[PDB]
Structure formats: C-alpha cells, structure tokens
C-alpha cells in the first residue's frame, strides 16, 4: 500500500531536495565501500593465520 | 637416565618454541594491517585539515575513520591462537624453552 | 496554524528514554534545519525538543503519530532499559545515547551490553 | 522564460528517471536477496569464531 502520491503543488526549492537526496545516496555509496576495505583486510588477515 | 630425559625436554621444548614464533607471527600480520588502516587515517586527516573542505566532506572523512578504527578494534578483539585472545587483553605468555623449571 | 499535538508515545517514550517528566511534558514537535559556517542550511528529520535537547523523533505525514527511536541496549543489569535519541556531538546532527551519564554513539551502543564490558 | 510545455516534458523525464531508480532498486538481487529493497544487516562469518 504505497505509491507516489501527486505532488500538492510545485516544489518551493527543487534543489534542496536533490542536495538531501544526493547526500542520502553519496552517504550510503561511501559506507558501504569500507566495508569493501574492512572485508580486504579481513580476508589478507585470515590468510596468514591459515599459513 | 638423566640424558634421555633432558633430551626429551630439550626436544619437546624446542617443539614449544616454534610455537612461540608462529604466535609472533599472527600477532604481526594482525598489527600490520591495523598499522596499515591507521597510515589512511593519518592521510585522512592530512586532507581534512585545510580551510577548503566542506563540512559534508568532514562527515564522510569521519564515517570512514569510525570504520577504520571499528575494525582495528574488530581484528584485534577477536583474533586468536588456539584459543588464546592475543590482543585483547594484557598478560604474559611464558614458554617452557628448556628442560629447566 | 496550530502546533502539532506530541502523543503520548512522544510524551512516554522521551519521558522513559531521556531527561525527565516534567521538561518531556514541555516539549513539542519542531523540524531541524542545521546552517553550516558557509551559509547553506541543510534540513533534517523531525526531532522531539524536551527542554533544550533534541530528540530524535519523526513524525508521519498522515494522522498526527510521533514515533520515538529508542536504542534498547541492557543496561547496569538490567534487561532492555532504553533511551532516547540525542541530537549533540561534534557536527550535532547526531543523536547521543546517554548512558549512565556517558554519552555513547547509537550504532557504537545498539544492542550492546555494558553489563559484559 | 522556460515555458509550460517544456516544462511538462521536463517532468515526464523526471518522473522516469525516479521511476527508473525505483525498479532498479527495487528489483536487484545477489543469490535471491533484495539488496536495496528493504533495510536490514547482513552478517558475515569472517572468521571460524561464533
């Protein structure tokens, strides 16, 4: 049960909406990408530990 | 009588010492990436420093310095040699090198 | 024209979570907007303002609800003892768990147990 | 200066570049597992500890 709903009337700052929805999306891009960094690490620990 | 057993000990605490080593060994690669995470930081910071950089830069600098230091403390915190927290907590390890107490 | 209404689940979840009855009776629901040195303002969620600390409460556009954000970490132990959002820190947008009068992070104290360590 | 009717197809692009990120988020999936549907933590088994 969601769906756009219509806008009520045009958008008083198109631009602050897109710098919000940007930060949103640029945020969460550079969290997840250290977890690519602690999972590297990670993996170049857990082979000399095997050795 | 007295020869076989300072051989058997000599031996068997040669077989210890070799242990000892490898424990080295693992506590080394588990600091050395936590020195490599922290030489980022260091450049991090480097950059955060100027006048220049914007405060929703500082924000994603800091978000990845936490995870950074999240995970020397992961990689530090569970990390083990039969069953023997290295880095976690302070104490001695003492090897029997010798047939002597 | 008129003040939204904060529900009882703003007034009793801010009360148990944080600061104290009286200030959470006070408080009532504002939008934050943090203005950075530059001169650009950045707007961010709802918050529940008790006294003069923020809480980190949002509000849905139909009916009049104010969900309140707890971290639920066991505490001193005791079992599921939760708190309320904290709006401080350096940048302070940022929402601060007090803790037996230290401040952890949310995420740093989400589901932890300081009973253990 | 830009006028209605432009601006009418400005918001036809809109409305299918957010339609798009919509699908392209909402249908993705490594091994079965909707990445960016809904939120939740993925746990994983890096080491032979619990």
Do not use: W
């Amino acid at each position: 049960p969601e769906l756009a709903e219509a806008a009520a009337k045009t958008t008083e700052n198109p631009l602050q909406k897109i710098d919000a929805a940007l930060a949103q999306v640029d945020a969460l891009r550079s969290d997840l990408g250290a977890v690519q960094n602690r999972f590297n690490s990670a993996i170049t620990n857990l082979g000399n530990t095997v050795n | 009588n007295r020869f076989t057993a300072n051989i058997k000990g000599l031996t068997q605490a040669s077989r210890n010492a070799n242990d000892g080593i490898s424990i080295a060994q693992t506590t080394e690669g588990a600091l050395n990436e936590i020195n490599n995470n922290l030489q980022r930081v260091r450049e991090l910071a480097v950059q955060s420093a100027n006048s220049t950089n914007s405060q929703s830069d500082l924000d994603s600098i800091q978000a990845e310095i936490t995870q950074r230091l999240n995970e020397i403390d992961r990689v530090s915190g569970q990390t083990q040699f039969n069953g023997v927290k290295v880095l976690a907590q302070d104490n001695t390890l003492t090897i029997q090198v010798g047939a002597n107490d | 024209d008129t003040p939204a209404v904060v529900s009882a689940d703003a007034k009793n979840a801010l009360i148990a979570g944080g600061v104290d009855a009286t200030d959470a009776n006070g408080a009532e629901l504002v939008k934050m907007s943090y203005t950075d040195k530059n001169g650009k303002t950045i707007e961010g969620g709802y918050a529940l303002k008790a006294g003069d600390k923020y809480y980190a409460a949002d509000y849905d556009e139909a009916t009049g609800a104010i969900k309140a954000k707890t971290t639920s970490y066991t505490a001193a132990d005791g079992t599921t003892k939760t708190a309320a959002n904290q709006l401080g820190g350096v940048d302070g947008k940022t929402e601060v768990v007090t803790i037996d009068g230290k401040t952890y992070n949310a995420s740093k104290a989400a589901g932890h147990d300081f009973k253990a360590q």
